[PDB]
Amino acid sequence: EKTHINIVVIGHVDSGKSTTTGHLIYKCGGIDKRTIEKFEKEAAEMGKGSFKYAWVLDKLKAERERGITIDISLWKFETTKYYITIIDAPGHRDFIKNMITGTSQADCAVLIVAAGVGEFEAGISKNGQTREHALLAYTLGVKQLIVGVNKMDSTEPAYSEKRYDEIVKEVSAYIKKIGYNPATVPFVPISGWHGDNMLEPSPNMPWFKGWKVERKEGNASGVSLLEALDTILPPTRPTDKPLRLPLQDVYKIGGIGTVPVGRVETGILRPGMVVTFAPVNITTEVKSVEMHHEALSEALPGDNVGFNVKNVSVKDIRRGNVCGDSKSDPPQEAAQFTSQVIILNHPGQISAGYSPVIDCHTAHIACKFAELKEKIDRRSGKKLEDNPKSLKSGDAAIVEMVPGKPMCVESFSQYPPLGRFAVRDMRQTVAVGVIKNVEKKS
Amino acid sequence: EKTHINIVVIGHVDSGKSTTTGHLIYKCGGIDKRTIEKFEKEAAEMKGSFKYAWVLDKLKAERERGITIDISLWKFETTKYYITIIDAPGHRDFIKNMITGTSQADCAVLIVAAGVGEFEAGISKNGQTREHALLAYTLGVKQLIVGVNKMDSTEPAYSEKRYDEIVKEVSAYIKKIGYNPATVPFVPISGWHGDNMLEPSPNMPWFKGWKVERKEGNASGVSLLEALDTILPPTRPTDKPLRLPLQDVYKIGGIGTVPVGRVETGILRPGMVVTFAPVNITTEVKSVEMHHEALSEALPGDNVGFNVKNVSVKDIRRGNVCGDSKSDPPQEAAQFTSQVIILNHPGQISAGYSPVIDCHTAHIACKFAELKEKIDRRSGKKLEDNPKSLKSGDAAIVEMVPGKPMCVESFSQYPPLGRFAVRDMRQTVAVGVIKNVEKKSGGAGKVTKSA
Numbered sequence: 032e033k034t035h036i037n038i039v040v041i042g043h044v045d046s047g048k049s050t051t052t053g054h055l056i057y058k059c060g061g062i063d064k065r066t067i068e069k070f071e072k073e074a075a076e077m078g079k080g081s082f083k084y085a086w087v088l089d090k091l092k093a094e095r096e097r098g099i100t101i102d103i104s105l106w107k108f109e110t111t112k113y114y115i116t117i118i119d120a121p122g123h124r125d126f127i128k129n130m131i132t133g134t135s136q137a138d139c140a141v142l143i144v145a146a147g148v149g150e151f152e153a154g155i156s157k158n159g160q161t162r163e164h165a166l167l168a169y170t171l172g173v174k175q176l177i178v179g180v181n182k183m184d185s186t187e188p189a190y191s192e193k194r195y196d197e198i199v200k201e202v203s204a205y206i207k208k209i210g211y212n213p214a215t216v217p218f219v220p221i222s223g224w225h226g227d228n229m230l231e232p233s234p235n236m237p238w239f240k241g242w243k244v245e246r247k248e249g250n251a252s253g254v255s256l257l258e259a260l261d262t263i264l265p266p267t268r269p270t271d272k273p274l275r276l277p278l279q280d281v282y283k284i285g286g287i288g289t290v291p292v293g294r295v296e297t298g299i300l301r302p303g304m305v306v307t308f309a310p311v312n313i314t315t316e317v318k319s320v321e322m323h324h325e326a327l328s329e330a331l332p333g334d335n336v337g338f339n340v341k342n343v344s345v346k347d348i349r350r351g352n353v354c355g356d357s358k359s360d361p362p363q364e365a366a367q368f369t370s371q372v373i374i375l376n377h378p379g380q381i382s383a384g385y386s387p388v389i390d391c392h393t394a395h396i397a398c399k400f401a402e403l404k405e406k407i408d409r410r411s412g413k414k415l416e417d418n419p420k421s422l423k424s425g426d427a428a429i430v431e432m433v434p435g436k437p438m439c440v441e442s443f444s445q446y447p448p449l450g451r452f453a454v455r456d457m458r459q460t461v462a463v464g465v466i467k468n469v470e471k472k473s
Numbered sequence: 474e475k476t477h478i479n480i481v482v483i484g485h486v487d488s489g490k491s492t493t494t495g496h497l498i499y500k501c502g503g504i505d506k507r508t509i510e511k512f513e514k515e516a517a518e519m520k521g522s523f524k525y526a527w528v529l530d531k532l533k534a535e536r537e538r539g540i541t542i543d544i545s546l547w548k549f550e551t552t553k554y555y556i557t558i559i560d561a562p563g564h565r566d567f568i569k570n571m572i573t574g575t576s577q578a579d580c581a582v583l584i585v586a587a588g589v590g591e592f593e594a595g596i597s598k599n600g601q602t603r604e605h606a607l608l609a610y611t612l613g614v615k616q617l618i619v620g621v622n623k624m625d626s627t628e629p630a631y632s633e634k635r636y637d638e639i640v641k642e643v644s645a646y647i648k649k650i651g652y653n654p655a656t657v658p659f660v661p662i663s664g665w666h667g668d669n670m671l672e673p674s675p676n677m678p679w680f681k682g683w684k685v686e687r688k689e690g691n692a693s694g695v696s697l698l699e700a701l702d703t704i705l706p707p708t709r710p711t712d713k714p715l716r717l718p719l720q721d722v723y724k725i726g727g728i729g730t731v732p733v734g735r736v737e738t739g740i741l742r743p744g745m746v747v748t749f750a751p752v753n754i755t756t757e758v759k760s761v762e763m764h765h766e767a768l769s770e771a772l773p774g775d776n777v778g779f780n781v782k783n784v785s786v787k788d789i790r791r792g793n794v795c796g797d798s799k800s801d802p803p804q805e806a807a808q809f810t811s812q813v814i815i816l817n818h819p820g821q822i823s824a825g826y827s828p829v830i831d832c833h834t835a836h837i838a839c840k841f842a843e844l845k846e847k848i849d850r851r852s853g854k855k856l857e858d859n860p861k862s863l864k865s866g867d868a869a870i871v872e873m874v875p876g877k878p879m880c881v882e883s884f885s886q887y888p889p890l891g892r893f894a895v896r897d898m899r900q901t902v903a904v905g906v907i908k909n910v911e912k913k914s915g916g917a918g919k920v921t922k923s924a
């Protein structure tokens with residue numbers, strides 16, 4: 032019973048994602064050497080060129096398409112502390128969508144960054160994907176980030192400390208601005224190609240004594256990339272987060288009173304708690320909690336429960352309101368929210384003002400796309416334009432949104448089940464999205 | 474601690490699938506009156522009126538393009554169960570949902586209208602009643618309830634004669650499909666008026682109730698709701714003959730040959746005499762390991778390395794299906810018939826087309842020998858026999874022949890080994906499930922000493 036970990040590999044195109052990932056798979060014995068060859072030969076037939084290592088990540092991306100997993104046993108490998116699985120990487124039709132719909136869900140993002148001359152500079156430029164990729168992971172609340180500083184073999188000189196330092200520094204400042212805390216991220220210099228420093232230290236890099244993480248949960252340190260992999264913190268576990276319980280229904284049960292029903296998404300609900308309902312802003316005390324027609328002292332995450340509340344009318348709270356704890360990040364009305372969406376098969380064209388209904392947790396409310404803030408390439412996460420005038424089917428984007436009626440939502444990283452939504456026009460699912468920030472009301 | 478149960482509702486266009494599901498939902502109190510009202514008001518924009526209907530309409534709509542946000546609206550409670558309405562025909566992703574099994578059903582409620590001519594349309598070779606039933610059987614669903622709907626509108630109103638005719642006629646058809654009609658409850662309802670859904674109807678004094686006789690114990694009832702409570706849960710995969718798709722096969726020093734894989738069905742234990750398809754090669758299992766520890770049994774859903782004496786690494790491979798040689802041994806496959814939906818492929822699939830089939834851990838080029846059928850993706854409606862070509866958005870029935878040797882099963886018998894994707898370079902072009910597999914004639918042995 033080692034715990035399961037999900038890894039997403041990101042980084043700018045040609046920075047070395049498939050190479051590194053494939054090498055790692057090879058070196059960890061997840062596939063037998065015979066079977067590694069079948070797929071090497073097979074890849075060569077299929078494409079012009081050599082696919083040693085890379086075929087692994089390429090097969091993976093391709094097996095995350097249209098919406099069937101048939102097998103993922105090749106992508107599972109064992110470290111000392113975890114069973115790790117590679118989930119997905121940028122560079123295919125569905126990447127953004129898999130990320131956004133949670134069909135591909137990750138506990139950590141390995142961000143590959145290329146150290147070769149001009150390579151790092153391209154990834155981090157206006158045409159590069161390094162920032163976007165980091166930004167995307169953060170948005171999806173992947174709070175564990177490892178940075179693999181790759182192709183060290185081909186710096187100027189080979190394996191330059193100075194170059195490693197320069198990348199660690201510049202990349203640290205960006206991931207800071209973005210919201211990660213740099214000190215928690217292992218910056219590991221490596222060569223995906225030769226293998227340097229993936230499983231043990233490399234004779235080529237004697238100047239490198241190792242990396243140090245400092246987190247809330249305590250310090251850790253190592254040399255290789257395997258060791259970084261094993262300092263990954265697990266989630267954060269819903270039970271330990273403040274209460275969030277979106278309202279499915281509200282009944283008036285005779286000689287008992289108002290009884291809201293819902294799934295505890297995060298936190299504990301218990302009889303006694305004085306809870307708050309957003310966005311109606313009403314605080315009151317839970318007389319009791321029922322599940323399977325039986326009193327509960329605790330309602331845990333995943334529990335569907337009735338709870339009787341004193342002094343509230345059935346007309347005061349409704350489906351889609353959100354209940355939480357009044358003395359622990361009580362829920363609030365969303366004045367507006369910023370999100371990342373991928374537009375699926377629409378009719379035509381969307382502009383500031385478009386107001387479809389947003390289905391989020393148990394709410395169903397029309398929201399205005401106030402500002403269209405970025406268009407984003409769905410294959411790659413690459414940003415393709417600031418304030419685009421209009422979006423259309425196939426685009427990913429970043430949009431600002433203003434709820435038409437009062438609504439309560441949460442950012443996807445704080446409260447996932449309250450941070451993912453679908454966008455709807457009649458029976459049309461036009462978009463799916465996740466919520467970056469939310470401006471709370473007063 | 475009632476187990477969870479997914480229902481899908483099928484039936485000819487206009488049999489009353491909408492009205493019945495709506496009514497059931499309204500009357501089981503899973504949604505409160507104001508919410509109902511909100512979605513009733515809301516539906517009244519997107520024409521006279523349209524009662525109970527918005528319930529399915531909505532559900533169908535929210536089963537498009539691979540996000541489900543919330544499904545609390547369609548869960549409801551029964552004495553014995555929590556039941557969710559999972560999907561229904563009449564929308565883009567219906568057949569896909571079903572084939573991919575994102576929508577998987579524990580039981581199918583088949584609605585069947587009973588007005589003059591309605592039934593006969595539905596049950597003709599131009600009618601979806603048979604096709605939906607057949608579709609269900611293909612997918613291993615398993616349990617079937619038939620709601621003989623619209624009883625209020627028979628001639629005369631609520632005819633027992635009419636109800637028996639439909640029962641007799643539909644039971645014959647589903648016997649032909651493979652279903653044991655003795656096991657299927659046939660409930661006369663009126664989804665519109667409510668008659669016989671939650672409780673017996675004063676309008677059907679003649680109806681003394683329905684009976685079913687299964688392997689796993691007889692039962693009887695009167696209402697739809699009771700019928701829902703007969704549904705038996707999952708066959709429980711551990712009861713089945715061992716199937717263990719090979720992920721990898723390692724040489725290990727001082728032990729020999731450790732195939733690794735995951736038990737999909739049945740049990741593996743040390744000292745079993747096990748066949749490997751397609752290669753047809755028997756042997757004994759000396760060791761069974763998981764998490765670096767030997768195992769007494771390896772259960773379904775277990776990822777296990779296991780040591781076999783008698784066999785060199787290069788005899789077996791990834792793609793091979795290991796099973797029990799004294800309990801339905803896994804044969805090789807000659808050809809197999811399958812149902813498939815084609816997703817964004819560029820060209821035009823013609824007879825003899827030859828892409829790779831991923832299926833369990835197998836990876837093998839198969840030939841689209843024959844193109845038996847072309848099917849509507851919204852509705853399951855068989856649209857054409859032996860079509861010249863298949864394009865995007867088409868479902869189909871196709872005969873299939875492997876290039877290399879291959880072991881596959883029918884979805885209904887061994888699910889994890891009966892659903893496949895069709896891959897063409899780094900593109901996924903189709904997904905499907907296997908109806909019939911035409912096994913291999915092929916003599917036992919090697920039985921390599923172990924006997």
Ligand SMILES: Nc1nc2c(ncn2[C@@H]2O[C@H](COP(=O)(O)OP(=O)(O)O)[C@@H](O)[C@H]2O)c(=O)[nH]1
Pocket residue numbers: 042043044045046047048049050051085088181182183184185221222223224225
């Ligand atoms: N010199 C050198 N080349 C590398 C290294 N890693 C990858 N490459 C090459 O850089 C190119 C891009 O690698 P690939 O893994 O395909 O990049 P991806 O698109 O980010 O997956 C390929 O030619 C790789 O062989 C490395 O560490 N050193």
Ligand SMILES: Nc1nc2c(ncn2[C@@H]2O[C@H](COP(=O)(O)OP(=O)(O)O)[C@@H](O)[C@H]2O)c(=O)[nH]1
Pocket residue numbers: 484485486487488489490491492493526622623624625626662663664665666
């Ligand atoms: N008289 C009668 N009419 C019904 C009944 N169930 C449905 N209908 C009507 O028959 C038509 C079929 O409705 P619908 O539920 O949409 O069928 P679906 O297309 O299979 O979902 C509609 O006009 C309904 O009003 C019933 O039990 N009795």
Ligand SMILES: [Mg+2]
Pocket residue numbers: 044045049
């Ligand atoms: Mg590349």
Ligand SMILES: [Mg+2]
Pocket residue numbers: 486487491
């Ligand atoms: Mg209709």
